[PDB]
Amino acid sequence: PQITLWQRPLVTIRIGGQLKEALLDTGADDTVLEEMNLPGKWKPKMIGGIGGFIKVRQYDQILIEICGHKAIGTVLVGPTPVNIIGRNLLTQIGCTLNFGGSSGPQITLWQRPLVTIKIGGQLKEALLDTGADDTVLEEMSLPGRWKPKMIGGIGGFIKVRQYDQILIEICGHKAIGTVLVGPTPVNIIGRNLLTQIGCTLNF
Ligand SMILES: CC(C)[C@H](NC(=O)N(C)Cc1ccccn1)C(=O)N[C@@H](Cc1ccccc1)[C@H](O)[C@@H](O)[C@H](Cc1ccccc1)NC(=O)[C@@H](NC(=O)N(C)Cc1ccccn1)C(C)C
Hints:
Layout: E1 2-3, E2 10-14, E3 19-24, E4 32-34, E5 42-49, E6 52-66, E7 69-78, E8 84-85, H1 87-90, E9 96-98, E10 106-107, E11 114-119, E12 122-128, E13 136-137, E14 147-153, E15 156-170, E16 173-181, E17 188-189, H2 191-194, E18 200-202
Parallel strand pairs: 3-8, 4-7, 12-17, 13-16
Antiparallel strand pairs: 1-18, 2-3, 2-6, 5-6, 6-7, 9-10, 9-18, 11-12, 11-15, 14-15, 15-16
Bound molecules: ligand A79.
Subcellular location: Host endosome, Host multivesicular body; Virion membrane
GO molecular function: aspartic-type endopeptidase activity
Main location: host cell
């Protein structure tokens, strides 16, 4: 199958005899599920994201079915707004990112999908992130007017500066779109620019 990124890549998993909805997320190392009470023992863990850390419980060897495909791995359970399928499970279902309509350059998720971007006129690297609505870069100087905005993620909300109609080159592809600038741990390329450069998920 192929998943487009016009929408959030939400899918049905099953985890127990339960269907759940979850987000297919290439920028997440880990898989995070909403609070549910599993039998088993767990380890305490702190995970971070945009706006800070939350505490989670780590369960090992959970089996999930993602789109008729089985995966077995570590899941973290906690007060997440959304169930996130991270690269630890996505690699097991054979999921790749493909640019150019389909293979096309093909990117595996065994490691973090980091690429070089050129943004006026520096090179940075950024994570290709199918779970993000928006593109968030580290603090930099872009020419143009901006406005304050707030965005959130795991851990909460950050204040960003929004610039519209900015040119960016992602792997030699041009995109012209909105970029948020603020105190993000990582440069994130989200669905707003991913779609411009013809990125899909395939398995
Ligand atoms: C779940 C965590 C275990 C995960 N963290 C994580 O993997 N690490 C910290 C390790 C790491 C380090 C360096 C590089 C890569 N990975 C995480 O938050 N990953 C982010 C990307 C990120 C990595 C590192 C630092 C900061 C961010 C996700 O991949 C990213 O897609 C998240 C997912 C998300 C979405 C909704 C709610 C919670 C989490 N989106 C976001 O944080 C964006 N927000 C949204 O898009 N929304 C809140 C809208 C929305 C609503 C509903 C559904 C989806 N999206 C920001 C960037 C604008």
